[PDB]
Amino acid sequence: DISAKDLRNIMYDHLPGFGTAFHQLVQVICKLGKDSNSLDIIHAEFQASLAEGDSPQCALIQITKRVPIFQDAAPPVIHIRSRGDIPRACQKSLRPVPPSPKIDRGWVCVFQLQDGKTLGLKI
Ligand SMILES: O=C(C1=C(O)C(=O)N(c2ccc(Cl)c(C(=O)O)c2)[C@H]1c1cc(Br)cs1)c1ccccc1
Numbered sequence: 856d857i858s859a860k861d862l863r864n865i866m867y868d869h870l871p872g873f874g875t876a877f878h879q880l881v882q883v884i885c886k887l888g889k890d891s892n893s894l895d896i897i898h899a900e901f902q903a904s905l906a907e908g909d910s911p912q913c914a915l916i917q918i919t920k921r922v923p924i925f926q927d928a929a930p931p932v933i934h935i936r937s938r939g940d941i942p943r944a945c946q947k948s949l950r951p952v953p954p955s956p957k958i959d960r961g962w963v964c965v966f967q968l969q970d971g972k973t974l975g976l977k978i
Contacts, residue, residue, distance in 0.1 A: 856894075856895070857894055857895065857898055858894070859885045859886070859888065859889040859894060860885075862884075862885050862888070862894055862897065862898055863881055863882065863885045865898070865901075866881040866884075866885075866901065866911070866915070867881060869905070869911035869914075870911055870912070872944055873942070873944065874942025874943060874944040874945060875942070875944045875945065876944075876945050876948040876963060876976055876977070876978045877911075877912050877915055877978070878942070878944075879942070879945055879963050879964065879976055880915050880919075880963045880978060881915065882964075883930070883931055883958070883963055883964050884897060884915065884918055884919070884925075885897075886931065887924055887925070887928075887931065888922075888924070891924045893922060893924055896922060897918055897922055900914075900917065900918050900921055900922060901914050901915070901918060904917045904918075916978070919958050919959045920959050925958045925959050926959055927957060927959065928957065928958045928959065929955075929956065929957065929958070930956050930957070930958050930962040930963060930964045930965050930975065930976075931964050931965070932964070932965045932966075932967055933964050933965070933966050933967065934966075934967050934969075935966055935967070935968060935969070936968070936969050937968055937969065938968065938974070940966075941966060941974075941976075945976060948976050948977055948978065949966070949974040949975070949976060949977075950974065950975050950976075950977045951974070951975065952965055952973050952974065952975040953975070956975055961977050961978045962975050962976070962977060963976040963977070963978055964976050
């Protein structure tokens with residue numbers, strides 16, 4: 856059986872750059888996928904989207920829209936010390952958190968900083 860780490864590696868292998876908002880979305884998809892025993896269907900949807908000719912980015916988004924655990928779901932909260940703990944390539948994708956952010960609308964996660972600051976990662 857494919858592990859969360861295996862899936863993360865598979866997905867990373869298709870992404871350009873590193874530490875981009877899409878890599879973080881891979882992280883979220885794998886975490887929530889593991890927690891809901893849905894890694895297989897997520898991998899199947901990913902591969903099927905690639906096989907149809909979708910970009911890998913679009914494949915990840917498609918997973919957020921097609922796998923029910925992400926449908927109308929709030930973004931996960933991820934506790935960090937500071938903004939420096941966020942990958943450089945994610946920095947310009949950080950935004951104030953709106954009311955009711957949703958993963959399937961592009962809100963990948965919410966970072967909670969130690970001093971109380973919160974930043975949403977938007978795709
Ligand atoms: O995305 C991050 C994750 C890890 O360091 C890590 O081990 N992550 C991770 C990914 C997949 C799994 Cl399956 C797990 C796990 O089971 O603990 C953890 C990342 C997380 C995703 C979510 Br949602 C909460 S934590 C992260 C990124 C920047 C700063 C801190 C954490």
